[PDB]
Design a protein around this ligand. Structure first.
Ligand SMILES: [Cl-]
Ligand SMILES: [Cl-]
Ligand SMILES: [Cl-]
Ligand SMILES: [Cl-]
Ligand code: NA
Ligand code: NA
Length: 135
């Protein structure tokens, strides 16, 4: 198939996403070409781009959106069941839905969702934005 189809399949099939350089290598593409294709896939709403430390990851947008829907439901349910607790253990959420991700990528996702106003983070726990303990 064409180089663009090869790259698209690499990213869309990848269950955690991957360093864009790794994707370039797997597709036998230059960085230039990989970047330009990623920019059009991002414009089409197909790929999510995430900096992780000094690396850049390309992730299927469908996968990323499905992660968020799992997280918000789990936290909604947790806050309903246990409204006095400050949040769910970060490591428990990781083990539920993110066990194949590198830990640093999981942390970058939590920090992104917090920045966006979706979450609030403590050192060990995670909660929905605006949640406060009560009875
Ligand atoms: Cl990778
Ligand atoms: Cl290159
Ligand atoms: Cl989302
Ligand atoms: Cl996983
Ligand atoms: Na992004
Ligand atoms: Na790097």
């Amino acid at each position: 198939g064409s180089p663009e189809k090869i790259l698209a399949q690499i990213i869309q099939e990848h269950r955690e996403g991957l360093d864009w350089q790794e994707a370039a290598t797997r597709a036998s593409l230059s960085l230039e070409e990989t970047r330009k294709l990623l920019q059009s896939m991002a414009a089409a709403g197909q790929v999510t781009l995430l900096r992780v430390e000094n690396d850049l990851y390309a992730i299927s947008t469908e996968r990323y959106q499905a992660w968020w829907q799992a997280v918000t439901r789990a936290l909604e349910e947790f806050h309903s069941r246990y409204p006095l607790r400050p949040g769910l253990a970060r490591e428990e959420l990781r083990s539920r839905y993110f066990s194949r991700l590198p830990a640093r990528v999981y942390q970058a996702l939590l920090e992104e969702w917090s920045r966006e106003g979706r979450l609030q983070l403590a050192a060990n726990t995670v909660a929905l934005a605006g949640f406060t303990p009560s009875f």
